Symmetry: D2
Subunit: 173 residues, 4 copies
């Protein structure tokens, strides 16, 4: 019914955010209230100094609470998720994703770090008590032909995105 | 509705198996067809030398394929799942858990090894292409009052098993 | 000969930093040039927006290059290292720890997350090509009796610290 | 100087074993006493049913204890080390690798599973109390030109093995 999408790259434009964009598009047809957030909606001072009286944190935290699902995207940095993304996750309440379906998306420079999603990001999402976590979609940088403007992907990436998004849509019932 | 239960303990009875026995009991209550497998169903030489023509592997494989969901249980050895269970997972086809809901259970000598589920078992189950992986249940040995004659758990662990099984049943629609 | 120490908690005072403090003390006797850094030496805007033209980054990056070793401390947040710490690590060059001995220290609220060091922090340090990574020291919050003033630890924690620091000192030759 | 080499592959000859054979050869060149073990030294039933009275386990254990360092090699199965190797690691005493330098080697069908070394194998070796764990070497199968009759590697992989072995030898002082 409601879905939070969360872009986790500190950079803009972002290759991994182009994956969230295609997802957002897909849902915006199916009349689902999609609330999109990126790191630029928070004050860097709040995230870095772990400040829970953050006003932006509160609004986000509120909107998450009412969400049925989360789609979250990260670049791979040093074989794991972005630090930047993590600093926000660290401010969520202990059971923040209790009862929600979670779909993780990632882009990375090398195929050699495909496993960063399963080994690094999923356990954090799980510590936040995600009720179920989908297989997810990792894409190396060669899969994204264009993102500065409209996202363009190889049919392989697009198809895998499609499949995941279909599974997520079903799981939200 | 078909579910496979898979005991990953090298000994029998085990603490981790008592969790599956309790699971079996609750799912039979709902007219799910439950099929139990343990490591004692395979010849040690077939698993330890990765022999793909193992007759039991072919039977397990046909059974898994027809199954809608999998509950797998392991003890926690050296900060991970058991090698023993892993010998069998290594012999399954590449997409063996595609289209399937997976619930992982585990028991551990110390709470210090709780992260073994998220950081070690889950990524293996995801390499097999599990469609979705539930939060799961970890119990340190002190929560399993009896695993020999009748599964008996502390109230907290029994409540967490029930919450997990209810989520797992709902997922199978 | 030279050692970087790096406090990774966004908070001050810090329980995990008290572990670095005892380490710093230990080395300051043995005439080793110890360069200490915490996250407060960087601008939160630089870390969050991934800015490599950071002046503080340069100085740190320079001092690391000449260091024989790194001792790094993190609180456990959401079953992994701090996001805050990670945002700095993400700005280091790809082979930043090539040729260095690395000792990781951590404090966490629950024993249940002892494995966050080995499963989450070590692989990042390794992606940065640490030449060798020591076993490390994890301490749950009950081990630290006092840190607002002088650090006070249980003899168990202190002894394990001692042992690790001895091993690190030897490895720096 | 005593080193144990331990082949974790369930088949022989294996790609991962060719790395150890090359290692053996280089260390004998330096009058290190090298002791090679593989899974074929143990009875499959002892490993798969965790039987502690395995005579070979007692011999391996005495040998490990007297050893200064360990080089262990595994193929990468389902995003991790082999279950087969893990069955043997599960049977070693709690502090088996205390006081020891460990070098991990691995080979994989795809570069996509490179993180199996850091995210899966290393935490197991650290649960055994390895004093220090070197960066190690991962090679995808395409880097091993021959493992049957004479180990032959691409120049890049041979250079990385040499760098690792030189670090390992230096560590043994
Ligand atoms: C600071 C930084 C660190 C990176 N480290 C890795 C890495 O460890 N492994 C990898 O495969 N790619 C690495 N890359 C490449 C990115 O993960 C890749 O280009 C990704 O698509 C960027 O996504 P984004 O546009 O959303 O930032 C790194 C990139 C940056 C900027
Ligand atoms: C060979 C062996 C190794 C073990 N290593 C660990 C360990 O590393 N960490 C831990 O928490 N418990 C360890 N234990 C204890 C088991 O995790 C715990 O007692 C478990 O519940 C036994 O489960 P089972 O009866 O299903 O086999 C080990 C037990 C055995 C037999
Ligand atoms: C934002 C936040 C998240 C935390 N999450 C966890 C956690 O997942 N697991 C845990 O054991 N402790 C958790 N804790 C407790 C801390 O890890 C623990 O109190 C630690 O000693 C703090 O160290 P520091 O003073 O250096 O910040 C968390 C604490 C904070 C402030
Ligand atoms: C049962 C089995 C499972 C495998 N699964 C994977 C895998 O999940 N990921 C991967 O990268 N390679 C996988 N492979 C390929 C091996 O990782 C690769 O070919 C390896 O180098 C074989 O090493 P070995 O000859 O030392 O046994 C698998 C091979 C076998 C026999």
């Amino acid at each position: 019914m409601r879905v939070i999408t969360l872009a986790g790259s500190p950079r803009f434009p972002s290759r991994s955010s182009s994956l969230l964009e295609y997802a957002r598009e897909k849902l915006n047809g199916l009349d689902v209230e999609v609330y999109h957030w990126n790191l630029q909606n928070f004050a860097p001072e709040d995230l870095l100094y772990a400040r829970f009286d953050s006003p932006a944190l509160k609004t986000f935290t509120e909107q998450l609470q009412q969400a049925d699902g989360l789609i979250v995207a990260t670049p791979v940095y040093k074989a794991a998720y972005s630090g930047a993304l993590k600093t926000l996750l660290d401010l969520l309440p202990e059971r923040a994703l209790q009862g929600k379906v979670v779909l993780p998306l990632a882009t990375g420079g090398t195929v050699a770090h495909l496993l960063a999603v399963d080994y690094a990001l999923k356990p954090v999402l799980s510590a936040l008590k995600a009720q179920e976590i989908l297989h997810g979609v990792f894409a190396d940088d060669s899969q994204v032909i264009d993102y500065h403007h409209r996202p363009q992907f190889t049919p392989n990436l697009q198809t895998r995105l499609d499949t995941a998004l279909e599974t997520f849509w079903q799981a939200l019932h």
